[PDB]
Design a protein around this nucleic acid. Structure first.
Length: 52
DNA sequence: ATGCATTTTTATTTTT
Protein backbone atom coordinates (compact mmCIF):
# COMPACT_ATOMS: atom_id res chain seq x y z
CA UNK A 1 0.00 0.00 0.00
CA UNK A 2 3.01 2.27 0.74
CA UNK A 3 4.59 1.41 -2.67
CA UNK A 4 5.04 5.11 -3.54
CA UNK A 5 7.88 5.17 -1.01
CA UNK A 6 9.74 2.44 -2.93
CA UNK A 7 9.37 4.25 -6.26
CA UNK A 8 10.38 7.55 -4.63
CA UNK A 9 13.51 5.95 -3.20
CA UNK A 10 14.38 4.43 -6.58
CA UNK A 11 13.98 7.85 -8.22
CA UNK A 12 16.10 9.51 -5.55
CA UNK A 13 19.03 7.10 -4.95
CA UNK A 14 19.74 5.16 -8.14
CA UNK A 15 21.75 8.14 -9.51
CA UNK A 16 24.38 7.45 -6.85
CA UNK A 17 24.20 3.69 -7.31
CA UNK A 18 25.16 4.12 -10.98
CA UNK A 19 27.85 6.68 -10.15
CA UNK A 20 29.41 4.33 -7.58
CA UNK A 21 29.51 1.36 -9.97
CA UNK A 22 31.06 3.55 -12.68
CA UNK A 23 33.71 4.81 -10.24
CA UNK A 24 34.56 1.30 -9.06
CA UNK A 25 34.94 -0.01 -12.60
CA UNK A 26 37.06 3.03 -13.56
CA UNK A 27 39.47 2.39 -10.70
CA UNK A 28 39.61 -1.30 -11.63
CA UNK A 29 40.33 -0.36 -15.25
CA UNK A 30 43.40 1.62 -14.21
CA UNK A 31 44.62 -1.12 -11.85
CA UNK A 32 44.27 -3.82 -14.52
CA UNK A 33 45.93 -1.68 -17.20
CA UNK A 34 48.87 -0.91 -14.89
CA UNK A 35 49.40 -4.65 -14.51
CA UNK A 36 48.81 -5.50 -18.20
CA UNK A 37 51.44 -2.98 -19.30
CA UNK A 38 54.23 -4.85 -17.55
CA UNK A 39 52.55 -8.09 -18.59
CA UNK A 40 53.46 -7.40 -22.25
CA UNK A 41 56.02 -4.55 -22.37
CA UNK A 42 59.01 -6.75 -21.54
CA UNK A 43 61.44 -6.33 -24.44
CA UNK A 44 63.60 -4.94 -21.65
CA UNK A 45 63.73 -1.11 -21.76
CA UNK A 46 61.16 -0.71 -18.96
CA UNK A 47 61.38 2.31 -16.72
CA UNK A 48 57.62 2.02 -16.14
CA UNK A 49 57.00 5.73 -16.75
CA UNK A 50 53.97 4.64 -18.80
CA UNK A 51 52.49 2.85 -15.79
CA UNK A 52 53.22 5.91 -13.63
C1' DA B 1 58.84 1.89 -24.17
C1' DT B 2 61.56 0.32 -28.33
C1' DG B 3 64.34 1.43 -31.75
C1' DC B 4 67.13 3.95 -35.38
C1' DA B 5 70.39 7.80 -36.93
C1' DT B 6 74.45 10.80 -36.03
C1' DT B 7 78.64 11.97 -33.57
C1' DT B 8 82.80 10.63 -31.25
C1' DT B 9 86.68 7.54 -29.98
C1' DT B 10 89.50 3.80 -31.16
C1' DA B 11 92.92 0.08 -33.54
C1' DT B 12 94.62 -0.95 -37.89
C1' DT B 13 96.35 -0.07 -42.67
C1' DT B 14 98.89 2.76 -45.47
C1' DT B 15 101.76 6.73 -46.97
C1' DT B 16 105.56 9.67 -46.18
Amino acid sequence: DALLNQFHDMKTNIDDDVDDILQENAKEYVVRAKLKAREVMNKGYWTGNLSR
